[PDB]
Amino acid sequence: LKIRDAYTIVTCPGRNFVTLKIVTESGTHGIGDATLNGREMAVAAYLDEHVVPALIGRDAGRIEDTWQYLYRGAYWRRGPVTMTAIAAVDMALWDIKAKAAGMPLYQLLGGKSRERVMTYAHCTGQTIEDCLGEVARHVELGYRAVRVQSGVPGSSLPAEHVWSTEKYLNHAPKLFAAVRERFGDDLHVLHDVHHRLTPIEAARLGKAVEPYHLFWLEDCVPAENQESLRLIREHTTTPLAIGEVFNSIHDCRELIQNQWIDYIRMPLTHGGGITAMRRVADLASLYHVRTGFHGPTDLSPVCLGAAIHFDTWVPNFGIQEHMPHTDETDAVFPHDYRFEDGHFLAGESPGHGVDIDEELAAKYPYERASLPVNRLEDGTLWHW
Amino acid sequence: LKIRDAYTIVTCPGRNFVTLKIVTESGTHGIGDATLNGREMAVAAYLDEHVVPALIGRDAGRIEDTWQYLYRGAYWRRGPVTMTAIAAVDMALWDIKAKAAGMPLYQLLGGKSRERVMTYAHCTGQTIEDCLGEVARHVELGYRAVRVQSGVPGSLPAEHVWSTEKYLNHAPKLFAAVRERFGDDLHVLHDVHHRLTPIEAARLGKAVEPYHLFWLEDCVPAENQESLRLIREHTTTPLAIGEVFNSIHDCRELIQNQWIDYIRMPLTHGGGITAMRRVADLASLYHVRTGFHGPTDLSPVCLGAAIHFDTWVPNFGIQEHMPHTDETDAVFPHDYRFEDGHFLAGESPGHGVDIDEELAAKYPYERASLPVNRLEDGTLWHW
Ligand SMILES: O=C(O)[C@@H](O)[C@@H](O)[C@H](O)[C@H](O)CO
Numbered sequence: 217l218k219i220r221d222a223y224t225i226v227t228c229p230g231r232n233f234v235t236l237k238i239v240t241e242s243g244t245h246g247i248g249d250a251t252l253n254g255r256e257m258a259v260a261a262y263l264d265e266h267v268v269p270a271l272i273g274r275d276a277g278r279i280e281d282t283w284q285y286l287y288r289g290a291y292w293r294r295g296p297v298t299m300t301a302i303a304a305v306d307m308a309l310w311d312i313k314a315k316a317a318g319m320p321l322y323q324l325l326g327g328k329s330r331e332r333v334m335t336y337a338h339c340t341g342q343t344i345e346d347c348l349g350e351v352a353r354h355v356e357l358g359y360r361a362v363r364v365q366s367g368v369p370g371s372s373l374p375a376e377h378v379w380s381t382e383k384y385l386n387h388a389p390k391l392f393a394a395v396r397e398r399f400g401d402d403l404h405v406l407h408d409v410h411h412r413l414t415p416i417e418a419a420r421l422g423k424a425v426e427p428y429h430l431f432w433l434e435d436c437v438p439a440e441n442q443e444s445l446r447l448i449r450e451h452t453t454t455p456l457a458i459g460e461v462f463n464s465i466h467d468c469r470e471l472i473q474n475q476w477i478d479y480i481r482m483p484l485t486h487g488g489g490i491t492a493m494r495r496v497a498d499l500a501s502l503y504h505v506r507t508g509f510h511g512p513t514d515l516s517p518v519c520l521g522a523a524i525h526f527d528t529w530v531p532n533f534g535i536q537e538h539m540p541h542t543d544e545t546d547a548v549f550p551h552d553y554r555f556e557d558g559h560f561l562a563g564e565s566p567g568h569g570v571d572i573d574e575e576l577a578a579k580y581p582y583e584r585a586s587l588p589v590n591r592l593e594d595g596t597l598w599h600w
Numbered sequence: 601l602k603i604r605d606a607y608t609i610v611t612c613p614g615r616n617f618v619t620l621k622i623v624t625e626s627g628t629h630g631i632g633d634a635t636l637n638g639r640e641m642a643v644a645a646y647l648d649e650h651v652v653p654a655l656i657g658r659d660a661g662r663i664e665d666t667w668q669y670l671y672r673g674a675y676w677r678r679g680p681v682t683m684t685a686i687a688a689v690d691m692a693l694w695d696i697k698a699k700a701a702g703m704p705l706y707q708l709l710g711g712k713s714r715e716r717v718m719t720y721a722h723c724t725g726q727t728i729e730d731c732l733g734e735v736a737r738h739v740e741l742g743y744r745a746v747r748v749q750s751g752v753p754g755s756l757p758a759e760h761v762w763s764t765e766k767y768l769n770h771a772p773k774l775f776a777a778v779r780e781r782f783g784d785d786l787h788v789l790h791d792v793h794h795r796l797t798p799i800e801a802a803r804l805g806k807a808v809e810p811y812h813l814f815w816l817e818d819c820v821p822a823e824n825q826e827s828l829r830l831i832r833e834h835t836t837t838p839l840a841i842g843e844v845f846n847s848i849h850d851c852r853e854l855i856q857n858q859w860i861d862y863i864r865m866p867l868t869h870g871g872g873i874t875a876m877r878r879v880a881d882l883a884s885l886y887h888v889r890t891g892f893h894g895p896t897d898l899s900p901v902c903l904g905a906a907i908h909f910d911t912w913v914p915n916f917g918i919q920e921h922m923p924h925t926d927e928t929d930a931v932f933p934h935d936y937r938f939e940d941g942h943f944l945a946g947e948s949p950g951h952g953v954d955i956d957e958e959l960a961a962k963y964p965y966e967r968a969s970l971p972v973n974r975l976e977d978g979t980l981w982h983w
């Protein structure tokens with residue numbers, strides 16, 4: 217069946233989301249996430265002006281061909297705006313194919329490899345003790361894994377934050393010691409360094425936290441130069457994760473083949489969708505690397521539902537990040553995935569099982585909001 | 601001085617161009633090219649909605665800090681849309697800085713390294729003979745270098761058909777004909793435009809060694825930079841690549857492994873003067889030279905700034921010249937000049953290019969997409 221209509225929907229049920237909707241001649245439809253936090257309108261224009269007009273009249277079943285058409289056809293390849301636009305189309309086309317097959321997406325991908333998908337929760341506090349308070353509450357909600365972040369002693373436009381690496385390095389290990397001290401060894405404990413270290417600094421950190429056996433240490437260093445991971449991997453056995461800022465397998469091919477990471481974090485909506493992420497997960501499986509999908513509030517329930525289906529099938533699944541969306545967001549994107557006892561259960565409806573309530577989405581107009589920047593104490597513009 | 605205003609202009613004097621204008625508290629101003637062929641409105645929105653609002657009140661003199669601020673601050677790094685928006689800001693701030701300095705941009709960059717900048721022309725035809733005719737006409741205009749292209753016998757994107765095997769059998773005849781009629785002094789360039797696999801490109805490279813090409817360009821899609829290894833190991837025909845790149849990270853290994861001789865990434869797509877300085881610096885360590893992509897889909901703002909960069913940069917190789925329409929030239933009054941096959945950098949402060957906002961408004965945006973290639977079985981291929 218041919219594509220009859222395609223259009224984007226922009227909404228701000230607590231924060232901005234951009235969604236692509238594709239409708240066939242038969243009335244069947246599918247949606248895909250197109251949200252790129254803090255650059256949302258770039259993807260909206262990429263879709264409205266350059267992609268959507270070319271979708272009309274295309275065979276909706278030709279997912280692979282459409283992917284190549286958009287990826288190669290763009291001439292300028294890869295990039296967050298580019299691959300997010302591509303992801304959105306791809307996710308809507310998988311949604312449609314699954315519906316057409318009368319199957320939940322996980323069935324179409326190869327069937328279920330697990331009964332539930334483990335998540336991790338965000339436990340953040342101004343201080344260690346505040347963070348420990350949050351770990352306690354999330355464990356009570358059933359989470360078996362937690363990401364711990366604490367303040368270090370000492371917005372429409374980007375907020376400006378200040379950073380000290382050495383203050384962070386001397387404080388971080390205390391957080392993890394305190395977590396283990398209180399909650400014991402069974403809990404999976406994750407930590408996101410969020411790009412702020414150099415490789416030898418991350419190496420030191422990795423070593424220092426070895427006694428606390430972290431599930432992962434995430435985004436140690438900016439990795440446009442993938443070789444950046446080498447010194448870290450050679451100096452510590454703390455497991456490493458990276459990739460939420462990646463959009464292409466070509467951003468992480470060397471990382472994976474060299475066994476420099478344990479978990480690949482690139483999610484569906486920024487990594488070119490289901491089609492592209494199958495290939496990434498495939499390469500990963502050759503090197504013992506597992507999926508650890510980025511799952512913040514700035515990827516919509518559409519991506520989350522798709523991700524949960526993907527997580528249900530993919531053999532080398534690692535973990536699924538869970539930052540719950542607001543009530544309002546959840547109402548704008550009705551879905552059949554469910555959270556129970558610290559795990560997700562995939563939906564059983566045909567498609568990825570997520571919809572968009574267009575009338576409700578219309579009640580929340582877009583509101584500009586930018587990610588923060590980080591500066592060192594001398595004013596140097598650093599990595600946030 | 602602080603930035604007082606910043607805004608984009610979208611105009612279509614023969615084809616689409618996007619331009620960023622930055623204006624300081626004193627009325628001084630600079631422009632930067634922001635044109636991304638076939639995806640123009642993505643860049644326009646990136647700038648209009650997300651970058652411009654943050655530019656206001658910023659110190660215009662802080663070029664480096666602004667570059668890092670937009671590059672790192674974006675969070676999602678690199679990419680065609682991303683690095684073009686950044687290139688436009690960068691180019692406009694260097695315009696402004698050179699203006700404040702009372703110097704043409706090349707002086708600000710380190711002074712002139714050469715007295716003129718060699719260009720190459722496009723010589724395209726349906727048949728080899730058509731091509732030779734175009735070569736002759738450009739040689740008479742003073743061009744010492746031509747990029748030769750002939751046909752292979754046998755609003756939305758046009759869809760072309762492609763056959764590698766027919767091309768591989770035909771292309772060597774074009775270069776042999778070119779040498780036969782024009783001899784050995786002329787530099788002869790060829791752009792394979794992404795259509796080959798590495799071992800195919802290696803075959804082609806070897807086939808054309810007798811004709812001593814200035815370069816063989818974009819042999820293979822190079823997202824995987826290792827793609828170049830087989831070609832380099834099997835032929836001594838020089839290799840150029842990079843018009844589709846936007847980051848030093850797209851080409852670091854290619855350069856460090858000496859897999860190419862010319863880096864093609866241009867100012868507007870490669871993060872501007874600031875980023876391209878670093879690319880040129882890395883290239884010089886490995887005897888790689890600059891060969892800026894210079895099609896009509898980069899505006900005269902880019903061309904003027906490129907000519908300046910070309911004038912200073914020690915490891916300059918060549919500058920591509922596809923002449924813009926007279927209408928384009930009128931929208932972007934400029935002081936670089938073409939003489940006898942070479943550019944001369946302008947001598948006015950800044951990069952020497954302006955935009956006529958009243959004329960630009962006479963040419964509204966019109967959507968136009970690049971072609972796609974399909975093989976004969978309908979496989980969606982590389983264009
Ligand atoms: O792992 C994470 O959840 C963070 O790195 C993200 O919340 C990130 O800061 C934002 O998603 C960026 O949009």
Ligand SMILES: O=C(O)C(=O)C[C@H](O)[C@H](O)CO
Pocket residue numbers: 291637791793843893894895896897920970
């Ligand atoms: O001039 C060249 O070398 C080209 O390959 C031109 C490109 O196809 C064109 O600029 C794409 O916008």
Ligand SMILES: [Mg+2]
Pocket residue numbers: 408410434435460
């Ligand atoms: Mg993170």
Ligand SMILES: [Mg+2]
Pocket residue numbers: 791793817818843
């Ligand atoms: Mg080319």
